[PDB]
Design a protein around this ligand. Structure first.
Ligand SMILES: CCCCCCCCCCCCCCCCC[C@@H](O)O[C@H](CO[C@H](O)CCCCCCCCCCCCCCC)COP(=O)(O)OCC[N+](C)(C)C
Lengths: 70, 175
């Protein structure tokens, strides 16, 4: 009676644990991957991250400048 | 009684001597056990008959749960957590079953010692060898894993023992 009215079967807890373990394992591997990706982008600068501004080339004036040699 | 298996818990045939009274003087044990039967065994049996028939009016059953076999820790990839969980649970169930096997053999040993009386040293050698074998196997499997034991630690211990055995056998063959 106690088992019937207060508790559930073992399969429920077993499969809930399986799902929880999957979630945590993927989170751990994602954390490692993100750390490595951040390190690579900060070192190489070719990624979307750690992009530091440079001078906009639309500011340059391309006209004759009173002297032939610029 | 049918409540347990006679093979898992064996007993000898239990030979009992017959009373051979050398005198006509009345002993107290037989008369006293007769009045004990009359005063205790009979009403207790009546109450049990009533309780058993009340139980028989309402008969219902329960079942022993069956667990199938799952791949063990040796077949699990290095970080695959789902198979590791399944293997760990299976290993824990097997560990408890092994504990219960050791308990059964120890019960056999204790019963033999009590039963054989003054002849227990000679007449309980079979149970002593059974317990020696089972204890050796259990100690090989689980002795030094400690708290925070796991299937991986048990596998590592087995692998270490197997390397030692293989090295010894190769030395013996080449000696
Ligand atoms: C002879 C009797 C022997 C057994 C004695 C039993 C004693 C029962 C009281 C002790 C209870 C222990 C604590 C249990 C708390 C948790 C229980 C909880 O899990 O059950 C919930 C229900 O909780 C109960 O309603 C709590 C009962 C609280 C009262 C207990 C008895 C004492 C109450 C005293 C009140 C006095 C008030 C003033 C009177 C004048 C519903 O659970 P749920 O998550 O769905 O479960 C899912 C699985 N299902 C679907 C199979 C169930």
């Amino acid at each position: 009676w106690i088992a019937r009215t207060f508790y559930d079967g073992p399969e429920k807890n077993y499969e809930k644990t399986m799902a929880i373990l999957q979630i945590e394992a993927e989170k751990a591997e994602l954390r490692l991957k993100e750390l490595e990706v951040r390190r690579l982008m900060r070192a190489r600068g070719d990624g979307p991250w750690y992009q530091y501004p440079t001078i906009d080339k639309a500011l340059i004036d391309h006209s004759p400048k009173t002297t032939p040699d610029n | 009684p049918d409540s347990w298996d006679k093979d898992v818990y064996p007993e000898p045939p239990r030979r009992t001597p017959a009373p051979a009274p050398q005198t006509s003087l009345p002993n107290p044990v037989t008369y006293l056990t007769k009045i004990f039967d009359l005063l205790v065994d009979r009403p207790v049996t009546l109450a049990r008959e009533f309780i058993e028939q009340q139980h028989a009016k309402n008969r219902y059953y329960y079942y022993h749960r069956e667990f199938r076999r799952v791949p063990d820790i040796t077949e699990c990839e290095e970080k695959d957590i789902l198979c590791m969980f399944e293997a760990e649970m299976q290993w824990r169930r097997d560990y408890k079953v092994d504990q219960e096997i050791v308990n059964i053999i120890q019960e056999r040993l204790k019963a033999c010692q009590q039963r054989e009386g003054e002849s227990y040293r000679q007449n309980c050698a079979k149970e002593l060898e059974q317990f020696t074998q089972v204890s050796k196997a259990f100690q090989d499997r689980y002795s030094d894993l400690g708290a925070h034991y796991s299937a991986r630690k048990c596998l590592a211990k087995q692998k270490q023992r197997m390397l030692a055995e293989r090295k010894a056998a190769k030395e013996a063959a080449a000696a």
